[PDB]
């Protein structure tokens, strides 16, 4: 029970499940994008996104962090911290 | 729609339906700020005396030492013999002893009188 | 001098030694005595182990 | 026969080499799993022969040697007896554990602690064998506490995980309540039959036997997960998977009812005793069947099912039918060993996530395992007629043709319906739902050891019930003469259970978001027994440990009665005798009053 | 080493200096220091805590001691040896406590009463006793080789 | 070996199976191969070890003792009679316990060999077991731990005086 | 009970309620489609009075929401098999050996793994080289006479490592 | 027997006129030689005891205890370094010679003939233990520990002398055979009740019984390892040996007057097994375990069955080995961390991966794992007390359950689940402590194979 994770792979999987989400566009979907400034979605659907990451990868993230991710790059960084992603 | 969750000594009261968490006065904000300050200073002292590369031994918590000294050595001082203490002492110390004593007197007098009659099942009772 | 001379030598010395509290002596003696008391008709393990001729009950 | 005794004693002694081998090796063998597997296979092929000789003629024999402490009028040697149960149960247990050796070769590929794991598992097998063989009852007690403590170690294999050693603590505690029951039984057998040995117990049948029967009842309900003392069972499922499989397939789970089976001449009579037997078993069966509904962890479901089947065997001992219960032991052993092994295959296939929610549709994710689980779960309740048919349905029809207690029959009725409905629900939620499991799939069963083990146990659980049930010497009179609507009722209850779980499934397809109606809650939340007992009985004894025992009675009162009275008396008397200031007129007035009080008051010259 | 005044003699009174000293000593809030009080049960002057505290303390805080929820400086409630997880789990229950005990006692009482109703009322399929061949199968029960024949027969029906 | 007089055996009974099959008989093939591949080298090794031990001869003698008289022929305090008397009585006590052991081993052998018909052809051995254990229960049972010889004789005197009073009242 | 502040806030309290109710709706509802329907219904139920300028009516509706939530929770809320309470709860803690060990080995095995121990020795010299001055000065430099927080500042000054990092960096890898 | 007495004397000037790095090999080697020398003793047979003089003799109760003492000395002597090896040379020599004089008076005591000689050698057994635990008591209340110790044991054991002198000048000499061969029953006058009360109460103090068990825990938590092993094993089983001898007299009133002590012992056995479930100071749990096992011993002594005495002496020897071993493991853990508390030192399944095997083996012997001797003892005592009464088995089994739970809690509390990861000073296991564990648990399993030796006079 050890499939190897990598940074490009986790970036692709997180961007896949963000692009599959409804009320964003596949055009203006950047890695360095805000969940507050440019995507314009609210905190509620932001924590729906946080729930999507928790339900995909298989672990909770605490609410001391769920205040303050707000961008996909720090999402990738935080699952990189939970998983310690090197071979 | 719900009987409002009567508590017990075993069932803990969860953080949601307190309902004291929703009457937030300024005193509760003051207490939470000071409690965070106390936890901050204690974690600061502990982490500075925890990450030292020259520190060989254990961090030697005074909390555990203080709790142990309060638990064992600081019972007999202090004390006064109260009505509650003497009552509970003579109840939970002497009561079961004298109760078990009387019931083994009863069982032994039964068995002694019954084998004095001779009508017991000791036709072969070798391993006494 | 704690295992190589004590432990295995003590294990042999206490694994067998003579009949501690006369065990197998009592085995073979009971064998011969019950064979005798079968071969001469009298009941095995006579009760009243002391002779009732050599006894004196006090009287009323 | 020299061949018979020789082959049985070498089936014993083949389980003695590998422990002393790796205790004497110090050069780490690579082929150690292969070695333990092939010595268990050699033990199996040596154990197949004398059982076939046993059914071929009989020749039913005991061995007894190396007597130690032959002290008083008794004696005790290492002795074990080849009759029927200890005769031909051993191949089933060796076969099951051999397949578990395969499955634990594969499942524990990624730990360097594998060698100690196989040492513990083989040691557990040795102790289970010495339990099931003996007739000298001290050796039975040896096997009893040994399988208890090996159960402790194998549940607490994964150190860390405070829930795991909590669970192992519960298991060893209910083993000790089995111990108090068993030593009460040993006490009565010694003080009223001059030994504790099966043969003289069977030789003299006493009249008043209620105290050792209550001791045996307490031993069985402690050992084999029965009501009042049952809830150590999901506790026992806290551990790893092949530990759980061997722990509750045959070994350590049937040992409670193994004893009551072994004392069948003693439990011939005493209808009060057989009433206790079957009423307790009906209570266990209904409570674990009602608790088994609405559960979502797989191992808790399989454990509640095995508690229900053990409750059927307690009812089977309640009626005077021990040999059908032994038939049920063997079929049940093949059955749920195969079921646990299929479950662990699924769980380690899907990243050890184990829960039925987030598992939904796994049919055609390769259908070897889905076929395996539908074989197992339709062998549950006995699709007529397979190996699972014989035990369960002849037991319930013979219970129906018996001077029963008129409520246990309805308990077996409702329990058969319940085990049907959770069997069908666990198949539906596991396999043929819609697939709800997280992505980056890593499903693989192209694996020689797993297909060998699952192959071997489906081939076992399809034929061995008929093969064993055919060539038994007839140890009872079969009834075979049932009224109408009393033989049909087995298939009737199983079919209505299938239809009932089917309509619950097709209401689960609907959308309403219904509400808990508290029977849902009583079924799901273990209803109230582990929570109430495990939160009340620890708090009470430790409330009494702190206040009454430690801080109150011993320390402070015993120190204030024996030391402190003496110390205060000596201190006050010192400070009133020697605390006299230094004047002379005091000393001579004391002299004068002493002279007067010695002359005239308390006289010394008269 | 360890200071002599980091031990703990005597209860609360008087209120300014002793409560200030206990606040400086046990590292607590001033008006949250609670002695038990002094009923003379021993107990020193050690604080009362909210007494459950161990299925509390939600496990994502990432404190120091991972299986005890410690933080190296808490005053550590008196009955802690009864409160390590693996000893007593005081979770907030999903239902109640009174509802739990009443329904469990009701179910077990009803099932034992139905067991008694079963015990007074057996089932039997309507069939007489077996026709044992030789005097209720005599001479093969407990003994009696030539003591007493016990004549009882069966007739074909 | 042993004395078959004191360890009796029932007369042997063995039939011969007659198939009436055509598989035929795997276990006969297996027991012939077992005898040829197991029983031969152990026989040769036992022959070797028997020669190596019978090259020279030892003996162990069964220890035998005399009969010093009784406690009833001993005086007031006078230990030099009581010592012989009580060690004679205690050796009788140990050999009597082992007699009880031998009777119980006979009872176990009768239980196993007579099979599931319990009350057939053990009833005479059960009878003598109840006889000898009635003797043991009457004689050595309720004396306790510090038996020397004197409590045994006190039990003897008190028992026969009680029986004398019982038969005097019955007459 | 949290490291950042003395309380969560009203906002995050409502948010944790939303996460818990949504998770309990997962644990209640299989087949995922009626789940998605009921999740959007719950989202609309919170959309009904999101924009209250009032506060006391908002927290009273929060309390009544907690009552209808606790009445309608599930017996087994669907805890993931990595969470505490869940199936794992440090499942492979058998091999989570702390790294203050592995230096108490015989030098035969230190000859078996040479480069790793040389690099570990220069790690420890990196640790001791910047332990006293920078770390203890940054700890006894910034805060108030009471610390009153459980965060800590980085070593943004010029160079070396942020303070108090050894038992944060040198942890087990959570799947060995 | 003087063949054992006089080399135990001549092992004392050995320690004086050996030098630095020279005392140690001499003492340990020669004490192991004396262990072989008393392994030669076991000849005892059949009819009676064996008389090693007009002055010394050995019952078969005394042979396994004497062999246990001369086995336990070199183990103890190696155990008592690394906490005094950095102290002075003369003080170290004084410590070793104190232990040798201690063993000498123990041999004096076990090979007694007259009960007055037994009493003199009883308190001569007492006086070195005092000096050891007070001089190296290593904690702030060794004062109070020694004071409680000496005053309890003397003031309980003081009227025993008066009762034995009264028996001396009412029934002739006090040889154990002439105490036997002449003993007459003594009726229920109250002077007989006080005489029985005096003798039995002095040994009650020395067991301990339940009302006087707070003699013990300070005297083990504030003692060095040598004095703790001496005290626990040899002194408590010596008190049991003394009551086992002197219970030959005064049998016709012990039935009438033995009722309160049995009930005190039973309910206090339950209470003591309860009190060692929750305490800190891990060293003290073995002490309360010892009080529990000695309460079971006292039940076995006051009931007077041969079954009871066989179970009693087996329980004595097995519990002596178990308690001495488990004290040595607790000293190993205190050498690891300077705590003595229970909840602090945790983890240790990873680290020191074979120290846990010895903890497991000791914990399962204290469980009474069934081939061991401790289950033999406890089982025969339960058999004899069930023949005593058909009701006391509730207390015995509840003792068994709570004993299982606290012994298992001792196992999985300090050595299960998570290291506290602020320890970082514990060394890997030395060869010395592993050698001490190997000296403990080879003879216990070797007697578990063949236990017909250790059963008492009523074999
Ligand atoms: C299970 C039972 C759960 C049902 C709960 C009952 C329904 C109660 C409600 O409707 S919520 C009660 C108070 N609701 C509020 O919205 C209070 C004020 N909250 C807000 O304004 C938030 O939406 C915020 C501050 C805009 C959140 O911003 P983020 O998004 O940037």
From Swiss-Prot, chain D:
Core subunit of respiratory chain NADH dehydrogenase (Complex I) which is composed of 45 different subunits. The keyword Electron transport applies. This is NADH-ubiquinone oxidoreductase chain 5. Belongs to the complex I subunit 5 family. Its EC number is 7.1.1.2. Keywords: Electron transport, Membrane, Mitochondrion, Mitochondrion inner membrane, NAD, Respiratory chain, Translocase, Transmembrane, Transmembrane helix, Transport, Ubiquinone. It catalyses: a ubiquinone + NADH + 5 H(+)(in) = a ubiquinol + NAD(+) + 4 H(+)(out). It comes from Ovis aries (Sheep). Its main location: mitochondrion. One of its GO terms (biological process) is electron transport coupled proton transport. InterPro entries: NADH_DH_su5_C, NADHpl_OxRdtase_5_subgr, ND/Mrp_TM, NU5C-like, Proton_antipo_N. It is found in: Mitochondrion inner membrane. The keyword NAD applies. The chain crosses the membrane at residues 4-24, 43-63, 84-104, 114-134, 140-160, 171-191, 213-233, 241-261, 272-292, 301-320, 325-347, 366-386, 413-433, 457-477, 485-505, 582-602. One of its GO terms (molecular function) is NADH dehydrogenase (ubiquinone) activity. One of its GO terms (cellular component) is mitochondrial inner membrane. Core subunit of the mitochondrial membrane respiratory chain NADH dehydrogenase (Complex I) which catalyzes electron transfer from NADH through the respiratory chain, using ubiquinone as an electron acceptor. Essential for the catalytic activity and assembly of complex I. Coiled coil: none annotated.
UniProtKB/Swiss-Prot annotation, chain H:
It comes from the Eukaryota. The chain crosses the membrane at residues 22-42, 60-80, 98-118, 147-167, 196-216, 224-244, 256-276, 284-303, 308-330, 351-371, 391-411. The keyword GTP-binding does not apply. It is found in: Mitochondrion inner membrane. It catalyses: a ubiquinone + NADH + 5 H(+)(in) = a ubiquinol + NAD(+) + 4 H(+)(out). Keywords: Electron transport, Membrane, Mitochondrion, Mitochondrion inner membrane, NAD, Respiratory chain, Translocase, Transmembrane, Transmembrane helix, Transport, Ubiquinone. It is a multi-pass membrane protein. It holds the Pfam family Proton_antipo_M. GO terms for biological process: electron transport coupled proton transport; mitochondrial electron transport, NADH to ubiquinone; mitochondrial respiratory chain complex I assembly. One of its GO terms (molecular function) is ubiquinone binding. GO terms for cellular component: mitochondrial inner membrane; respiratory chain complex I. Its EC number is 7.1.1.2. Core subunit of respiratory chain NADH dehydrogenase (Complex I) which is composed of 45 different subunits. Core subunit of the mitochondrial membrane respiratory chain NADH dehydrogenase (Complex I) which catalyzes electron transfer from NADH through the respiratory chain, using ubiquinone as an electron acceptor. Essential for the catalytic activity and assembly of complex I. This is NADH-ubiquinone oxidoreductase chain 4. The gene is MT-ND4.
